[PDB]
Design a protein around this ligand. Structure first.
Ligand SMILES: CC1=C(/C=C/C(C)=C\C=C\C(C)=C\C(=O)O)C(C)(C)CCC1
Ligand SMILES: CC1=C(/C=C/C(C)=C\C=C\C(C)=C\C(=O)O)C(C)(C)CCC1
Ligand SMILES: CC1=C(/C=C/C(C)=C\C=C\C(C)=C\C(=O)O)C(C)(C)CCC1
Ligand SMILES: CC1=C(/C=C/C(C)=C\C=C\C(C)=C\C(=O)O)C(C)(C)CCC1
Lengths: 10, 224, 221, 221, 224, 12, 12, 10
């Protein structure tokens, strides 16, 4: 989604 | 006491504090201003969450559920608190100041006043600090009532830990005020009420199709 | 002191419905729940009149508080009563409304929220009548309510209520340091479910504004 | 032949509403849509009376077909009309109901289904009045409807309708071999949205059975 | 013609055909019988789907969406068709035969009769074969109206391909009957109606809490 | 069903 | 608001 | 869930 994106590259 | 150190929640708020010392009052269409600031803050909001103890140990489908259920109250709590520094206005993370007169002219005056009187003024009068703000937000984040959680217990339990640390911090930093912990938690029902009503305004601006709205915000309004 | 939990307990006790068995209904659950509500509104006032200091607020404020608080006050009430049911709620009219009726009648989703976020949690922690009366008093003393004159007065009354509650809680349940928080943290859910009910009620009130025209009625029989 | 698409086209044309502009409503959309429906039910009959062979079915069957088909018949009708709106539906009373009103009134979710699964697809393929009239005729000739006497007769009439439709389609749109399928494949969605509407309508009809009691009314104002 | 060979859809139906030559009439509580057969068939249903051309190239979140939206009509179509071999009853994949009298006694008679008269009898009278059944199911599977699809176009398009292959197969295998293709597609609205009404019965047996229901079925009734 | 019956008689 | 006012006067 | 399970070991 974008949220998933953001939460994985962490 | 436990496993949820307030230093680390405070470290979290400070890492996302947009450091801003001069604002421009924005009389133009405030709604677009607020939308863009919200889009902008959604990105920091995730950074913020990832820095909350144990957040990132949660089933991933749970991190998503919490952020998607808590974003609107989380961001409301954020700018309400930065806004204690204004008078009759709110201060956006984008450097804009929106005055209440201007919210009224744009027909969102009522919910605007509800934020001033129920959140901002109270936060200012009790001198809510950044630590307590972070805890309140962490409490709101670890919302064990969110639909579709798989780790409900882990969430509940992390909630309990935030509010145990909050309470102990409060007792220690503000022993003058034995009611303070309660006063803090009792701001959450207003936070919840005002969050529902803003989401209603947003969803409706989205359904009317006119009002701009950027892309992370849009993904949120499709996620609810 | 000055805000004693005992009189708050009294106020709750004085308004329990005098209650037999509880028969189902499956037939028009929504109606039944709205009648119970109307009925309980009368007793809600009496309850309020019995909360210390309430009637020494200005008359005008007493009405603002109750117009602002009732729906959450009534939801808290039937939720706490309904702890002994499994998946249903117990109305003051002595009717039991099953989760399965509630979905059949189209309010399944707000009903489930009542069961999960209120009833089940009231049940898991065994919230007692004293904690419930205090929580309701806190809600009754809402210093955010619009148009209040004695703002600061309500603020002081709510502050009283929660200090006595914290007190009651620390002493009746000292095995549970989190109990007081846990109780206050149910109020956001209450707030929320309260708002969703009022939407429902406004929608049924406009429906009922205007019958269905007669051919349309005929196609529905 | 014997089931000519031209007379089917005639039947549609004869029932277009004579239509000015289309003002909004945002005020009681649900009511407005139910009034339009009642209104169109009269004209639905006239439409049916003009579909070939319909009136040579037994009287009893003519009523079964129309009691079984109307809601899908009316939904298909306003959907096809509403193609020229963006995110709204156009009622026969000359009112336009915006998607944003529909969510505000609590029927957002079935409304969106009408826009996405009916209107948008009718629009993307430019379904014409002939295809729409045929689709409605197929629906009108439902040989599954309960209690029919001339079962086999309706079966033969529906078979006629779709043979002429396939025919019309192959010849008016020979650039599109999938068109005929694509048209029939909208009927499941219609069926489905039709059922969801009737739930809505049964619920408003029971609401309206019984006013709100007077104190409850007073809390709502 | 295209990229959607009916041999492969037929190969799909046959790989999941429970090969059954003797049934036991089951007068006991049919509802539990039907639930267990449905749980059992959910597992084959996924095997079946994975064997449908291009199904498994879809975004995974889309495979889940399709199966979760189509399971009830898909399984209804399956046992209705096996059941052409009975008379006034249905034939479960578990080897049980449930008679209509017995459905009536258990208070689900009406929806039962709707399956007999709208699906089974029609499928039997037009001698619907396994190829056409598979296509119909593949059409139902590639449902581009399902909420939350990300690849809508790919889904639409695979739908179109199934119905192009169906139609060509039909024209070739049954040139006596030029209406056959339409007759097949026109069973889908009944399939949709009856599928909604069974899901309503199920969801309601689940909410009453009495009626057993196993675990894959349960995951489906939580997924809708 | 009075309204539908009546309407079904009239036209022709 | 007639009902609420009236009720608020009576008890005491 | 179980469905995911089933769909991946494929
Ligand atoms: C409050 C408010 C609205 C919603 C704001 C929301 C949901 C979050 C704002 C984020 C900001 C302003 C982030 C930040 O500045 O840190 C709407 C759009 C209803 C307009 C009326 C006032
Ligand atoms: C929760 C709920 C609803 C509203 C209930 C409210 C606001 C008051 C009920 C109080 C009772 C039933 C009093 C008592 O018996 O103590 C409505 C009608 C929207 C329908 C769905 C479930
Ligand atoms: C779709 C829909 C509804 C029902 C509409 C039906 C079944 C008939 C409308 C026909 C019209 C509006 C006729 C015309 O103007 O041609 C209800 C009321 C449940 C509310 C939500 C949207
Ligand atoms: C039809 C029917 C019901 C639902 C059945 C469903 C949703 C699927 C059955 C699967 C089977 C029977 C698989 C197979 O045998 O291959 C319920 C429970 C409402 C009882 C009434 C008759």
């Amino acid at each position: 989604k974008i949220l998933h994106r953001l939460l994985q590259e962490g | 006491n436990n496993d949820m150190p307030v230093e680390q929640i405070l470290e979290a708020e400070l890492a996302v504090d947009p450091k801003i010392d001069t604002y421009i009052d924005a009389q133009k269409d405030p709604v677009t201003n607020i939308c863009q600031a919200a889009d902008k803050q959604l990105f920091t909001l995730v950074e913020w969450a990832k820095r909350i103890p144990h957040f990132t140990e949660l089933p991933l489908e749970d991190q998503v559920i919490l952020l998607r259920a808590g974003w609107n109250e989380l961001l409301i709590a954020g700018f309400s608190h930065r806004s204690i520094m204004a008078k009759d206005g709110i201060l956006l993370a984008t450097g804009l100041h929106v005055h209440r007169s201007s919210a009224h002219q744009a027909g969102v005056g009522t919910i605007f006043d509800r934020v001033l009187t129920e959140l901002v003024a109270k936060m200012r009068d009790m001198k809510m600090d950044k630590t307590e703000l972070g805890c309140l937000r962490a409490v709101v984040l670890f919302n064990p009532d969110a639909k579709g959680l798989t780790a409900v217990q882990e969430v509940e339990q992390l909630r309990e830990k935030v509010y145990a640390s909050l309470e102990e911090y409060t007792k220690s930093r503000y022993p003058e005020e034995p009611g303070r912990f309660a006063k803090l938690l009792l701001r959450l029902p207003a936070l919840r009420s005002i969050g529902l009503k803003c989401l209603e305004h947003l969803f409706f601006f989205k359904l009317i199709g006119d009002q701009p709205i950027d892309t992370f915000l849009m993904e949120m309004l499709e996620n609810p």
